[PDB]
Assembly symmetry: D2
Homo-oligomer: 128 residues x 4
């Protein structure tokens, strides 16, 4: 069966760091971008929609505008990698990588964000 696999289902990241979360899918021979769909989301917020080679920010939340990208290089190697830059406390939660490629599956990834008092205080009072 078409199986999406996650080498890590748990990421522990420092506030302000960069994170690449990886979802693997089978690619035999050459990638057919025309048949590939990748959706990345966290708790029903859309981060990435890559449908036949193009991305649509349509439901792409402002939270992930400027900070989230899919690493396109990795796609031909069967790696749908979400890179988030300048990780914030609001990025903690359960991510889903949803892949359709002649077959469909999704996996969940848990992200925990560690932060110092100063970042935690700002998030606490000014809710990001």
């Amino acid at each position: 069966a078409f199986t999406v696999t996650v080498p890590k289902d748990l990421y522990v990241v420092e506030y302000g760091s960069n994170m690449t979360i990886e979802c693997k899918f089978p690619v035999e021979k050459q990638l057919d971008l025309a048949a590939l769909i990748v959706y990345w989301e966290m708790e029903d917020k859309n981060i990435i929609q890559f449908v036949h080679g193009e991305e649509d920010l349509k439901t792409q939340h402002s939270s992930y505008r400027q900070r989230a990208r899919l690493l396109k290089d990795q796609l031909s190697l069967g790696n749908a990698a979400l890179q988030i830059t300048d990780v914030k406390l609001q990025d903690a939660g359960v991510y889903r990588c949803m892949i359709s490629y002649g077959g469909a599956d999704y996996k969940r990834i848990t992200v925990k964000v560690n932060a110092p008092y100063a970042a935690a205080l700002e998030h606490h009072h000014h809710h990001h």
Copy 2:
């Protein structure tokens, strides 16, 4: 772009009743069952996995056993209908219909379950 559609994104159902939650997908010529994938879940629990024109029970959460059925006859009209029988308070929450058919999409449906005191008390203690 391939779009899954839900006529109702909210269902309010009575404890003990039967419920059909429906999601639509475009079928603009003879349904190709071989290319259709339908996945139904609620809060990470698998209810239905319809691949290669048949259903796989190897994944059902065991809270949905004998209670969950996908209505196949409708797929040719582009309706992925989940029928749940003997609705329980545990069936309340956010459902997802995930469809792959030359394109892929999903929609969320919220189910609220109304129950009398007697049923609610049992669910409360457990």
Copy 3:
């Protein structure tokens, strides 16, 4: 030790209905209103504050205005009864009755609200 008791820790109420949720506290003979503090809340929202023998609804959450009242006759019988009118889906959740009377204690009460589609839909969008 001073013990607050709740005969029912679970209430099931209809949208638009009325509800009286009760917490019991020990009273021997004359209630001393001067020493009695009763605070009722739900998820951090103040519903009722009876201090120095009078209701103090200057801390009441706006969601409970005109809808919430402590039955002051009941206090003399050792019953802190919160009566809520025109129950909304937002009223569902965990209530706490906090009592200070020569001693202090609290208990939790769960309220579930049954509602028709029309009320559920408005709550769903708001």
Copy 4:
């Protein structure tokens, strides 16, 4: 002068495996009367501490807070209900409530965030 509990910090950030003291202040005029003081500490409706007229009372204490939690009794005479929890775990993260009756009654909320490295986070993730 309504009886007011005050928290100098409503947010604590603690490292996994460390010890934490979280504090709630209450008005004490002259000398504390232990006989009139009740302090309850709880987190998400689990009881951690019950101090009723001068002693601990395990009337509602949850088993997780067995030999991990104490009230600093010295601090009470200064009007400080200080909860010390030892060997902080990821499950100790959340909203704490200090409930004080001393003539009047009030409660305040304190948020604890627990930072943990991958090894501790992984154990919590599976267990």
